């Protein structure tokens, strides 16, 4: 008689945010008591939740390790066995750490990437969390070297399930369920096995000031969007693909006024899947 | 005769009721031989037919490993389907997959299959050529563009021509005595009065394998299709099957009626009658 305890939309939640605990027992989101990691001490002086327990606005007092017990009337005890444990982690309590991808955020399908979390603050543990509904974070102890605390999260074999927006957090010794503010987000993109597009310049890759240059991304594969990336990525540009007379799917990226140029690559992608890209096109050097 | 191997996958989201569940089952004709359920404490591909139990540890580990990756792929597939269909994150949805091969008497490929469904309706299917797809709606049309762009049919065709046919052949030799020896049905006719003017005649077929069978009632040598009640073939629970056919007859006319049974374990069709 084990209930199913869950947190909605996420168990990793900012202070001031909202999270609901649900206790699914005997084909219902029925009555239950909540317990903290103390299997016989019900919280809020033995409060019986008549429905899902909505914690809003979220405070640091909500952070913790929970189990529930569903109402089991005719059993010796009027309550079920303990549920699965759900750890509510409350974010926004310390300065954010930094997050970096090694060798970079674009990962070939089947391969591996290191997500490095680091801080000047001495954090006991580091948490890596992919953006989404009902996502579980990974934890590593913080390593210490030359005044910095750090952890290396190995992600792979790369596939769509591992692609997305990642954020990392630190926690300090006496408050394990209290996380820092999140690091700046990192977009991890899976490349391939979708066929590489073709990248060309119009009228060509050699240009001088005051003259326009357009980069054309093309394929016979039905991509819905194209991504133009410049070596030493400041920001990727994206445009919808348009079907041509000869059945190619193309996008034209006009380079603006006084463009510095450099090395370019392009990628195709599909509607509703922004972190899943084709193999990169061959590089194109644009001269000014 | 001809034989078939199929894998059936069910992936189901259930928010607030459990984590997304993935169930895989394997069949050789009408016999289930393996299973995987992501809900077990330690999930593994597991034997379901005694003839597969003596496959070495390398077979079970290799299958467990592939099933774990499939559960991970279908969990993500449920997520993408919500974006495709503009559906709430609170609802429960189901993806179903069926794939496998049909071989002839020689043991050579007759037909390859790979079919998917979303919420009980066709989503995407591999065509008979094993090199093109049929998409049922605008959402599956996105999946088609991705699979054509990644050359998915090519990998499917190599499985269906090679490994699928080769493994089916190995399984047929493994379980030769239950898979390739047709068990004829045990038959009998029962009588049940309804009133003083009518009665029910029921023809039974029990303990048969394979599931395929034909039961018909004839009145003086004419087929009683319009008035025959035919129950769905059901499992006996011991890898054999059961079926019955009933006809309403006027009292004192039972002698005019004959039951006819056709099954591969029967060299000639059987004619039965009540007495």
């Amino acid at each position: 008689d084990k209930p199913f305890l869950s947190a909605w939309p996420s168990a990793v939640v900012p202070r001031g945010g909202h999270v609901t605990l649900r206790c699914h027992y005997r084909h219902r989101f029925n009555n239950f008591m909540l317990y903290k990691e103390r299997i016989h001490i019900p919280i809020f002086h033995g409060r019986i939740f008549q429905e899902s327990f909505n914690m809003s606005p979220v405070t640091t007092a909500h952070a913790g390790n929970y189990t529930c017990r569903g109402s089991h009337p005719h059993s010796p005890t009027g309550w079920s066995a303990p549920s699965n444990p759900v750890v509510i982690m409350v974010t926004g309590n310390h300065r954010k750490p930094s997050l970096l991808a090694h060798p970079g955020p674009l990962v070939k399908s089947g391969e591996r990437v290191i997500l490095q979390c680091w801080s000047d603050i001495m954090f006991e543990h580091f948490f890596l969390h992919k953006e989404g509904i009902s996502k579980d974070p990974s934890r590593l102890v913080g390593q210490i070297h030359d005044g910095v605390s750090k952890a290396n999260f190995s992600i792979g074999p790369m596939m769509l399930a591992l692609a997305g927006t990642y954020r990392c957090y630190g926690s300090v010794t006496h408050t394990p369920y209290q996380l820092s503010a999140p690091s700046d987000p990192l977009d991890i993109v899976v490349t391939g096995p979708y066929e590489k597009p073709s990248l060309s310049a119009q009228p060509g890759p050699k240009v001088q000031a005051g003259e326009s240059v357009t980069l054309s991304c093309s394929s016979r594969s039905s991509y819905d969007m194209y991504h133009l990336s410049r070596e030493g990525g400041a920001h990727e540009r994206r445009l919808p693909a348009v079907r041509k007379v000869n059945r190619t799917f193309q996008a034209d990226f006009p380079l603006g006024p006084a463009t510095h140029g450099g090395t370019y690559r392009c990628f195709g992608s599909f509607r509703h899947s922004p972190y899943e890209w084709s193999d990169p096109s061959d590089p194109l050097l644009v001269s000014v | 005769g001809s034989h078939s191997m199929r894998y059936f996958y069910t992936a189901m989201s259930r928010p607030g009721r459990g984590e997304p569940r993935f169930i895989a089952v394997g069949y050789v004709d009408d016999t289930q031989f393996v299973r995987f359920d992501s809900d077990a404490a330690s999930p593994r591909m597991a034997p379901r037919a005694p003839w597969i139990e003596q496959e070495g540890p390398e077979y079970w580990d290799g299958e467990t490993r592939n099933m774990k990756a499939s559960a991970q792929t279908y969990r993500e597939n449920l997520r993408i389907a919500l974006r495709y269909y503009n559906q709430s994150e609170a609802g429960s949805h189901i993806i179903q997959v069926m794939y496998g091969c049909d071989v002839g008497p020689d043991g050579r490929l007759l037909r390859g299959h790979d079919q998917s469904a979303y919420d009980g309706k066709d989503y995407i299917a591999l065509n008979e050529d094993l090199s093109s797809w049929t998409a049922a709606d605008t959402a599956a049309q996105i999946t088609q563009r991705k699979w054509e762009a990644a050359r998915v049919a090519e990998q499917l065709r190599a499985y269906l021509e090679g490994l699928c046919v080769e493994w089916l052949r190995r399984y047929l030799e493994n379980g030769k005595e239950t898979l390739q020896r047709a068990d004829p049905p045990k038959t009998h006719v029962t009588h049940h009065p309804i009133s003083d003017h009518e009665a029910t005649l029921r023809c039974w077929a029990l303990g048969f394998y394979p599931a395929e069978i034909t039961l018909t009632w004839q009145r003086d040598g004419e087929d009683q299709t319009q008035d025959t009640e035919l129950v769905e073939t059901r499992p006996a629970g011991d890898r054999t099957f059961q079926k019955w056919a009933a006809v309403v007859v006027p009292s004192g006319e039972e002698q005019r009626y004959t039951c006819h049974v056709q099954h591969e374990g029967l060299p000639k069709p059987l004619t039965l009658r009540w007495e």
């Binding site: 399908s109 074999p157 769509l160 | 592939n66 495709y84 999946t143 499985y159 490994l163």
Partner: peptide, 10 residues
């Protein structure tokens, strides 16, 4: 034996 899962989904 089951088909080796594609790195690619829906």
């Amino acid at each position: 034996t089951s088909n080796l899962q594609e790195q690619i989904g829906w």
